[model samples]
Target chain A: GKITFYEDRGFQGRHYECSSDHSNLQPYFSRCNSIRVDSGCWMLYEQPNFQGPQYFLRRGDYPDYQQWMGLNDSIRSCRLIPHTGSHRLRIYEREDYRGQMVEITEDCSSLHDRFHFSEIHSFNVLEGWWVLYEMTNYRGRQYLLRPGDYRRYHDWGATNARVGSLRRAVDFY
Target chain B: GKITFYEDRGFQGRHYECSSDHSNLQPYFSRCNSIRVDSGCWMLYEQPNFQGPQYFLRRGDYPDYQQWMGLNDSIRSCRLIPHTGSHRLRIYEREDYRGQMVEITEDCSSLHDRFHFSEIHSFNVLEGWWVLYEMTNYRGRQYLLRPGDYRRYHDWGATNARVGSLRRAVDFY
Candidate 1:
């Protein structure tokens, strides 16, 4: 994953390029006003050592700090999110993979319509990566899932236990 | 936060109670088949030092290992989730808080009907905690948000930049 950072708006001024995680970016540039994520998903931290506020960036062009909804023009660190392979996940209406279950190989726009259930108490990811959404059609809080069995919503680091949709991790790539 | 773990089904067998983060639980118990989250949100790891498969549990009664959706009855560690406060958020149709904006202090079940917008490129959290949904009526992937500014959909660590609903982070409590 490669990303280019600019000191001025619209990809102008002195720039710095990176393809790996940087705990500190002070030596390369004093500030970053804009950025262009050439490839992969990345997380930008406002403070050094990957501390403080964070901004997530995908393969796209951010013309200015405002485009990133950044509070300021100072970006101190960044890290790339490694992409996993394909996805195969199982959603269960009850915990422990009991009750109604559905195997999803692709993205489901709405779990309510597809599974006839609005709440997901547990899930198992047999392969690849996935993201579980809180609302249908991929809206709301997103929980990233690797290959594993998440017995409860919190297992995926979710603040709540409700799930409305799911998709493969490769979709982002 | 305090949680109790049992070695057998139905809260039976040897039990162990904890109130803080435990990296290894093998010394305390050989296996855990049930659990009771007395207070706060907690995560249970299947391996030592909070590693391997994990399970999230809120304040509730888990009668057996199956109740937690576990494939086995092994538990090695646990951690508690800290609670913030109430939630206040703003959603913008365009990046950088531009375009049609909507301020929400309460949960919005559907952004399309409430804001007449199907997409949100930027947002700001003035208070509390919130969760963004990928689809309408809170039915999709979930992304937890603390107080901060998210300029683009990717800023929230999303694979895709789509939001369909917004809600306060009160469900977990």
Candidate 2:
């Protein structure tokens, strides 16, 4: 997978082409004002060596840093997530994979409205990759999950243990 | 922050670790041999529910998986450090911070190398907002943390007590 970073918005200015992870992007470009994912799924970090806030991007063109919903154009790191397979998982309202459980084969816009609940205590993934949202309509803190068994909210790495929505990790663009 | 995993080489396995933080490592993994760390760090699991062997990672990398060795690939958990300057505890190893304990004020790169122990049994977050990692280098599974006392890993909503790293949650995005 490859991606290109731009120092200025509208895909102009000094540019850097990356086909792999870069821990410190300062050497390649002073700032990432814009980006273009030539291939693969990638995660952008605000700090060097992949620290601080993160933004997920798939293969597409982001004319400006705002297109990726970034607060700043300073990008320090980038990583590519290989294309896994189809995504499948189950969400639960209680821990230990107990309580009311809902199987998800695709993205869910709102768990509050769809599952009629505000908290998710556990889950189980049967296949593929997934991203869970703490708020409805896929807005809020994002937690990524792979094929495995999450018996409780913490098992999936949730601090609040509440989930409002979820979706497969397909291309964002 | 560094770690090495052996496959069979006695120093044979393909070793991989990060001096920096990594959120997802599905691309650079296959199996582990032994494990070791140069500094204080943490490790997690995909299964075994913190039932696997224990290893400590500190500051440096290793030649083989067995160098800090234990089990093979199957690692599904992670964490990192930076000390967010706030008091909040997130612990895990197997079930309820039974294995290792880590305290954080900020983000940690690798819990295995930083803490010198494997598996998370339980933890207590005394202050600030935080996020727990299921995999190392702040990748894999993620959990949110709030102010409160958790006596057991399950109390934090974890199906198993396995934590790799932790950080504070300043915003959802």
Candidate 3:
């Protein structure tokens, strides 16, 4: 799980190559303008301790901050995501996992087309990580779902309950 | 595709329902903060004539502009995407499709892991619509690829040539 961070765009300037999670990247690089992920999936954060705006990345080259949908070159922390072979999740229509519930184990391009729920209020990611898309076909705002229980939409940092699609975050893919 | 635009967030205030492409939406609504897609895929533009920032939507609910990752409530036009079955595309390592290329017929989760090219300079969308992800497994910035020829990275609204994954934008998904 190797990842490289660069101080300038197009893989220029001082760079830092990482193979594990780091709570604070400020000492390694003053700022990050581009990145090159050699292996594994990682979550880059704007602030230290893995807090702030999160950007998920996999094996690829991000020539600039915009390529990662970053507003600026302020990446301060990074986290390595573990590989998983099995995935299981549950979405609820009401808070606290109450009300119409649906369990899913596969990628769904259109939750609205597969189920009657247009909004999902709670989530239980029992195994593996997943991403919730705000629009169908994996378009729009993305919310990363780590294995845990989210009691409400706000718990996932979402302004609303609407979720159009769901996809697993597996390194094997 | 049937879509409804709302004047305020959370599907509030005055609204307009549209079933087809509209070059201008100002005549029906002063502003749009939310939306609801009843069927098919549609692309909303920030300005008239389908120009400016584009947001692709499908059958679902987007209760606020933030849900669609819109910087503001400035939707002014919409275009429906035709349903496609067969998917095909070609990505080049250099502009004008002059370098080593790869023909893709299905979704690719990790271009970097499967191909040697870390950057894609051109594209030929031979059949169906697709999306270029900045990172593997469909993570990071997304560029909607309508079937056609793109001579350079800028042609697809990308700031750089780096691309990590490719997915078919099909209605059937």
TM-scores for chain B, in order? Answer: 0.60, 0.41, 0.86
Please provide TM-scores, in order, for all candidate models, with all chains considered together.
Answer: 0.39, 0.44, 0.47
lDDT of 2 by residue, A1-173 (tens): 88898899888999999898788888778888888888787777787887666677777788878776787877888777668776667666667855444455677787665542345677778887777777778676666676898886665555666677777877765
lDDT of 1 by residue, A4-48 (tens): 999988999989999898999999998888898878877677778
Model 2: per-residue Cα lDDT at residue B154: 57
Candidate 1 docks with a DockQ of 0.01
For candidate 3, give the docking quality class from DockQ. Answer: incorrect
- Judge candidate 1 at residue A156 and give its lDDT: 77
TM-score order of candidates, best first?
A: 3, 2, 1
Interface RMSD of each: 15.8, 16.5, 17.1
- State the displacement of the C-alpha of residue A95, model 3, in Å, after optimal TM-score superposition: 1.2
Off by over 4 Å in 2: A116-118, A149-162, B1-173
Per-residue lDDT of B139 in model 2: 62
Candidate 2 C-alpha lDDT tens digits along B1-173: 45554444455646566554444444566565555555545544433343333233445545554443445555534444443445545454445434333344456766665532444465667676566767777664455555776667655556776677776644221
Off by over 4 Å in 1: A6-9, A12-16, A22-33, A43-56, A64-79, A171-173, B1-173
Q: Rank the candidates by lDDT, best first.
A: 3, 1, 2
